[PDB]
Design a binder for this molecule. Structure first.
Ligand SMILES: Cc1c([C@@H](C)Nc2nc3c(c4cc(=O)n(C5CCOCC5)cc24)CNCC3)cccc1C(F)(F)F
Length: 477
């Protein structure tokens, strides 16, 4: 029936030396769930003759980079396509030598019941690859040449529509190379006016924390973070690519999210500790809590928990004389914001699963859970002396990426202000410093502005030449 191992590797039999399945679920579901296997066995079951497996295709193509390179994958699926057909029977040879057509009964069967199935499943994998994962081919024009040489040498009536589907996707993605962004945008309620404060509209030189409006700070950062959140692809997280040695190649949108998070959070800390006058620093902290209010009103959980991160920082959290003068209202607001994180993020996930769109989810819990998954599961399971790729680990990370992805569909009914947007895109509080040494700077600055117990607090001069009373978090209705 099936071909032999000396001509075709994807016809080696299943064993505990080559595949492990999950026994959780599946009491003869038809399709088993692979816990682990060799890459050959994974590719085989990705392109199986008995069944299509679209959930495995998606999960595989999101994650394969943790176990297999693009060029290796393309070689493997092409090898899977190249099935050896059987030789004729002795009677069919006799028919051929007589000048007649052979009956060809097993060959006709094997084509219909093995080859065609596997080959159409290979094309299904290729089609999913060029649609949802085209960045591999954007990063590798030789990979694209190989794919297009493959797809354009496929022969057969049965393969025609798949080849045409794949090539239309490849051509459409080639247009995307020079096109880029556009306006789409699911937005439904009426948007507000842009709110303005000490900064006169367009006078970018004047823009600061206390001079832009706190509602508008929150709304433009929410617009920004919504776009940053929505730009991260699933595959950028698998293997923790942001902490591999090709991060700035292969985590482009992910590092932009991470760096924004760092720059805004350290900018809040910087704003606080470099205001050495206590009374001004209360105004700073109070304004950041008002930005947190508007983040809470917008359901930008990412912006809430960035302020939580700044206020719980070593430099800021010890500034007891500042927080003593923050009113009980704003203290309750920070307490409730901290409570989002308490008990493993219990209140966060309960709130997130009960609010209505739009939102920006907190991004850093997903990174944390992916790292816990990465550090807590082996890359290979050992069986019988052989090492099998832990695909259950990859499925676990892929599941977490889908919990991100379900919220990437929901932009805001907020008006963009392009100068405030560009201002916040260009935050760099550290400058030429690095994070650790900058936060040690900020901690030393904290100890300057509020010294420790038996050294009394000195009086420092003002730095703001402008009114420090906020306009408030209520809009100009
Ligand atoms: C509420 C607040 C906060 C918020 C954001 N922090 C915190 N708020 C609560 C609890 C916390 C426990 C804790 O272990 N941490 C630490 C986390 C690791 O980093 C070092 C701090 C921080 C906490 C316990 N439950 C009650 C609410 C920051 C500054 C000023 C104020 C205000 F009270 F003045 F408003």
């Amino acid at each position: 029936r099936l071909p032999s191992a000396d001509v075709y590797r994807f016809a080696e039999p299943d064993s505990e030396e080559n595949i492990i399945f999950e026994e959780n679920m599946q009491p003869k579901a038809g399709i088993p769930i692979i816990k682990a296997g060799t890459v050959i066995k994974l590719i085989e079951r990705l392109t199986y003759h008995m069944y299509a497996d679209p959930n495995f295709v998606r999960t595989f193509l999101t994650t394969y980079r943790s176990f297999c390179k693009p060029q290796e994958l393309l070689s493997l699926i092409i090898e899977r396509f190249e099935i050896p057909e059987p030789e004729p029977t002795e009677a069919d040879r006799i028919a051929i030598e007589n000048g007649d057509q052979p009956l060809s009964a097993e060959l006709k069967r094997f084509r219909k019941e093995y080859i065609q199935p596997v080959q159409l499943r290979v094309l299904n994998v290729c089609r999913h690859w060029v649609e949802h994962h085209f960045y591999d081919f954007e990063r590798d024009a030789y990979l694209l040449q190989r794919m297009e040489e493959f797809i354009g040498t496929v022969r057969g009536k049965a393969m025609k529509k798949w080849v045409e589907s794949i090539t239309k996707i490849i051509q459409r993605k080639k247009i995307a190379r020079d096109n880029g962004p556009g306006h789409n945008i699911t937005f439904q309620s009426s948007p507000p006016t842009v709110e303005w404060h000490i900064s006169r509209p367009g006078h970018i030189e004047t823009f600061d924390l206390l001079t832009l409006h706190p509602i508008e700070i929150a709304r433009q950062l929410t617009l920004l973070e919504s776009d940053l959140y929505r730009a991260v692809q699933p595959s950028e997280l698998v293997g923790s690519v942001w902490t591999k040695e090709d991060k700035e190649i292969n985590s482009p949108n992910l590092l932009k999210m991470i760096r924004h998070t760092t720059n805004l959070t350290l900018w809040f800390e910087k704003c606080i500790v470099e205001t050495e006058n206590l009374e001004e620093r209360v105004a700073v902290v109070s304004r950041i809590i008002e930005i947190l209010q508007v983040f809470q009103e917008l359901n930008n959980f990412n912006g809430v928990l960035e302020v939580v991160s700044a206020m719980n920082s070593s430099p800021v959290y010890r500034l007891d004389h500042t927080f003593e003068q923050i009113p009980s209202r704003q203290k309750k607001i920070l307490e409730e914001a901290h409570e989002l994180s308490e008990d493993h993020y219990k209140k966060y996930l309960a709130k997130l699963r009960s609010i209505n769109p739009p939102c920006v989810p907190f991004f850093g819990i997903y990174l944390t859970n992916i790292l816990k998954t990465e550090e807590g599961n082996p890359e290979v399971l050992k069986r019988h002396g052989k090492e099998l790729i832990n695909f259950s680990k990859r499925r676990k990370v892929a599941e977490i990426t889908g919990e991100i992805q379900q919220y990437q569909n929901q932009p805001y009914c907020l008006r963009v202000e392009s100068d405030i947007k560009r201002f916040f895109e260009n935050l760099n509080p550290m400058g030429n410093s690095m994070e650790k040494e900058f936060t040690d700077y900020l901690f030393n600055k904290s100890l300057e502005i509020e010294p420790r117990n038996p050294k009394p607090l000195p009086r420092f001069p003002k730095k703001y030449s402008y009114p420090l009373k906020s306009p408030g978090v209520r809009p100009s209705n």
